Amino acid sequence: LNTLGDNGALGQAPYIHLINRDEHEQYYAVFTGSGIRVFDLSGNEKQVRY
Amino acid sequence: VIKTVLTYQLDGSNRDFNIPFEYLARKFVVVTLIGVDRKVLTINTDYRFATRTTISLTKAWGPADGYTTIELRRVTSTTDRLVDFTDGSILRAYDLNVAQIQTMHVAEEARDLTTDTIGVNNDGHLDARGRRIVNLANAVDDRDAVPFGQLKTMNQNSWQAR
Amino acid sequence: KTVLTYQLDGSNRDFNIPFEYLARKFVVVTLIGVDRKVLTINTDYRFATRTTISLTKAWGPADGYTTIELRRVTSTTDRLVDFTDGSILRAYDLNVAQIQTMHVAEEARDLTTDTIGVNNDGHLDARGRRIVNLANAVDDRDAVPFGQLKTMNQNSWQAR
Amino acid sequence: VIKTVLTYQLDGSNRDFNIPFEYLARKFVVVTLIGVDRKVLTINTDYRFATRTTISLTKAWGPADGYTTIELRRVTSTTDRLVDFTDGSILRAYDLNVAQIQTMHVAEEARDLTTDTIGVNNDGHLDARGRRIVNLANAVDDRDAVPFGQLKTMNQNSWQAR
Amino acid sequence: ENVQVLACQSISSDMYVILRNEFNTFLARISFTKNAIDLQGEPYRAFMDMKIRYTIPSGTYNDDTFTTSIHIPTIYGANFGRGKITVLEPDGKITVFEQPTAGWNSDPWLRLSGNLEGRMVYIGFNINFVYEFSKFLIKQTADDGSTSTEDIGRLQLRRAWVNYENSGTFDIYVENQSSNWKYTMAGARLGSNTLRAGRLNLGTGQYRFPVVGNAKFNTVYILSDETTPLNIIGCGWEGNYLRRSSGI
Amino acid sequence: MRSYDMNVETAAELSAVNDILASIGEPPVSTLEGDANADAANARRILNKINRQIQSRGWTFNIEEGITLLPDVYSNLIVYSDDYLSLMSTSGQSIYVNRGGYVYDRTSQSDRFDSGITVNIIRLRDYDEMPECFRYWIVTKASRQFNNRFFGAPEVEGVLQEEEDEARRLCMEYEMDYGGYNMLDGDAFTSGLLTR
Amino acid sequence: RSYDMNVETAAELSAVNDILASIGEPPVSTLEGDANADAANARRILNKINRQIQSRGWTFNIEEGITLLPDVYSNLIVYSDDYLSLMSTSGQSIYVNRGGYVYDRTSQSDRFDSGITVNIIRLRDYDEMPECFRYWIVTKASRQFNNRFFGAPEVEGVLQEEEDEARRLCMEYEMDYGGYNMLDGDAFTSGLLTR
């Protein structure tokens, strides 16, 4: 589907949760030990404000 | 060691000769009566295939006619391929087996025709294993080898100039 | 028909290739093999169009080479068609494989011709002909064409 | 780019030997010990395949016995095919590949053998194709029509004859 | 061994997976639909890891070498380390490339013979499918749903087979104590009306492969790294059984 | 030897049909490219095998006594082709055998011949050339072998055994009718005695 | 069509025929990396049967005046495994295999300086055998393969019958080949015909 990072984007031990909201707004959140990177199921990263 | 070229003595009345080599068509057999001059025979005119693996000449063609031997040789084709695969084909053994057989037959014909033992290049250079060429030779071009006739002419010029 | 020796008349430039190809890399050309010229494509070799050739440089006899051969050498290790268990076995692929494996034998037959002979008396024999082409020698243990025997003409001029 | 012979030199007493080419079976690799004659060494009596591409001999066979070259030629049979196809088989891809490999081995062996020869062309000209004729020492003797490199010194001598 | 799955949560029947190769992180989808096609134009639902629908661009084919080279980082957006990358064409022809000694990163080029400038191909990695049958022993079911294997009795000698449905090629390995044997099924028979040139070689039937052995020191497993589908219905075995060698 | 498919089908179609019927297999009508049948090639193989065996049995119509096998004049080698089912000599103990692929004179320990040898040879010939009785015997034996290799059917095996015995009886009758073989004036020893 | 291609017989068609003796299907390669557990087994059985049949002793495969040359340096003669039998031309054999070299029982010595003449049977390829012996070997191999692995009763019985028939044919072939005569042509009686 797509490429996310370069082996370090998600850290060593990220906790990943699937967001099945609606049939067109599926999101797949990744919680790295430092931040979060919510990548759409198509691989398009969504910039998450902090 | 040669399998694609056989030569049988005729000896007068003998109108049958065996075909040990394995051919892919009756068109790949060339009977060349050797003697005073080589002649090639045509199919079903003075040359017949009584059955596979044998020949049936119409005439004796003995030495009385000047021909001493008959050479049955194989000359597999190169431009025309006996097998042509198609999309709807069932791809049986005959097709690809004949393809490989034809290629290998051509290769061994090429190998046999050069059965003569000759100097083979050792490492990117032709070799003569210490064997020397002897007979007469001319040199009319810049790239030709040098015989010693030119060497002699040099000698007479040198010892006749003064 | 596979190995055709043409003449490098001064700047012949574009020569002709009469044999069909399978890949553009099966046409090996050499001026006169001395240093094992590789003659890479484009650099010093260029296919102007199919069944023709265009030399980048004139490469005349003055350069030391007076002929170029268009010998075809179909690769053996490199195969256009390779077979795999889970495949279709295209009819065209089978035909191409057969043609490729047959072109080697075609070259062998097109190159096989009445060859030299050896006589127990005197050693090697030539029946009674002369070498038409040969490479200038560099070792002191082999033959030499006229190209290395200009001293004969020099001495002839000196004598008279 | 790799020849099928790689002629060797004894250069004293040696046992281990190497081959550059690849063979389908060790029945298609001949080792003819040339030198005083065309002596050929068979298998199990003079041969030993310690491992692939490392043919070794029972003893040295040094030059003292009169043998100087052991060319390890490679010959693939054109009558005993490795894989012959049948209409009731499975058509393994390994079978098709083995068949093409053997046919290519037969043709490449028949193209290498014939290309290292001297003979006339369709125009009626035999060309060495720029292949230096090395190893022909003693060239000449009753006007044998070739030098072996002594021509340089002879012509140097004749140049300063005066 | 080079990849690290980070999560494989599925919605209804699609498993969305992130893989962490030593170079990049990939997001992939696995579909469990019974009879369907993942990507438009696929001939037979190719079983290929990282399957992608790639159209070769112009300027890759080179006449001088008769090769069509495609850069992997151009296909994907990352680099890979292992695996036998497989290329599939719309009809079904396959060109399998072995792993370069130094890995795919050093030599990420896929060189294909011929002019494939503007046509279509499916790229992806092979899937190593391994199944090992338990020892083929005399197993009998009691009145209820309990199975008892007959350990007592002479170590039997056998000969086995296997079935398949709409499958392709699968290798079968049988290993004894000392030696081993291999039987690759490839496709359909040679003279059959199912092995036509230019058409897919998928079929259904039964394959019988010899299994001569002791029935407990003889292991049989199926290997299939090809992209062609493989479905197995059942298996079996024929052998000779005696009542001896109760305890050795 | 030869592959089963190489020969064309003229009357071998009837023999193949009989072989396939010896097991119930319905009769094909092509025996050619349009076969796609696994039970037809496996019948032609049996037919060829049995034809070779029957020819090698040494019948009087294919002994062709008095051949003049000729050697290559540059190599001086005769070829013991696989088609040569049995090569022997007109006289007593024969001295010709097969070494490699060429005739070898064991007594002289040499396979180089100058003029040409005379032998009692049995050269393989197609199934069509066999007489009708021999064709029937070959078909029956091939049917028996096909049935007991592929299907079984012990009753069919017994019926084919009886048919094979009858066919062999007919073939022997044909051979004795063909040869003549008069023990007086036809024998190689007694005929001389009757000189009187 | 109109061609004369020759298919293999040396362990290639024989293996296929052995396989077809049972229900097995015909292979093609017989040397493919795939062990196949039937081409190997069929080849082993065929080779063993060929060796046994050759060792049985026949007119064509028995070589009468074969002379064996000892190694000059060691004065030893190697009793190769291919030497199926080794009997002296005379009535009494005096040569046996000790270690891996010929040993003279009566002389109790294996140091041969000149040489020996012996009736020797040497192993020869399967294809080199006549048609009768090829058929007998194939039938015996098929019967043994079946009996060892498949154990089909009816096939075993028919193959036993065919083995007996093949042996009869081979024996008649040998009798025809020898042309042995109890009159002139025999050793003891030929002398008596000096009347």
From Swiss-Prot, chain C:
Described by its record, this protein's role is as follows:
Structural component of the short non-contractile tail. The tail comprises six fibers made of gp17 trimers, 2 nm in diameter and 32 nm in length. May attach to host lipopolysaccharides (LPS) to mediate primary attachment to the host cell.
Q: Which domain of life does this protein belong to?
A: Viruses
Protein's UniProt name = Tail fiber protein
Q: Which span of the parent protein is shown here?
A: 6 to 165 of 553
- Subunit details: Homotrimer. Interacts with tail components gp11 and gp12.
Subcellular localization(s) per the UniProt record: Virion
- Species name: Escherichia phage T7
Q: Which family does it belong to?
A: Belongs to the Teseptimavirus fiber family.
From Swiss-Prot, chain E:
Task: State the compartments where it is located.
Answer: Virion
Membrane-crossing ranges are: none
How the protein assembles, per its UniProt entry? Interacts with head-to-tail connector protein gp8, the tail component gp11, and the fiber protein gp17.
Q: What is the annotated role of this protein in its UniProt record?
A: Structural component of the short non-contractile tail. The tail complex is involved in viral genome delivery. Forms the end of the tail, including the canonical tube, the nozzle, and the small extensions below the fibers. Once the tail tubular structure is formed, the interface between gp11 and gp12 generates the proper environment to interact with the six gp17 trimers.
* Protein name as annotated: Tail tubular protein gp12
Task: Give the species this sequence originates from.
Answer: Escherichia phage T7 (Bacteriophage T7)
Curated annotation (Swiss-Prot), chain F:
Sorted keywords for this record are: Viral genome ejection through host cell envelope, Viral penetration into host cytoplasm, Viral short tail ejection system, Viral tail protein, Viral tail tube protein, Virion, Virus entry into host cell
One GO biological process term is: symbiont genome ejection through host cell envelope, short tail mechanism
An example of a Gene Ontology cellular component annotation for this protein is: virus tail, tube
Q: List the disulfide bonds.
A: none
Q: Which domain of life is it from?
A: Viruses
The record's subcellular location field reads: Virion
Show the InterPro entries listed in the entry.
Answer: Tail_Gp11
* Protein family per UniProt: Belongs to the tail tubular protein gp11 family.
Oligomeric state and partners? Interacts with head-to-tail connector protein gp8, the tail component gp12, and the fiber protein gp17.
Query: What is the annotated role of this protein in its UniProt record?
Result: Structural component of the short non-contractile tail. The tail complex is involved in viral genome delivery. Forms the 12-fold symmetric toroidal domain immediately below the connector protein gp8. Once the tail tubular structure is formed, the interface between gp11 and gp12 generates the proper environment to interact with the six fibers, each made of gp17 trimers.
Protein name, as recorded? Tail tubular protein gp11
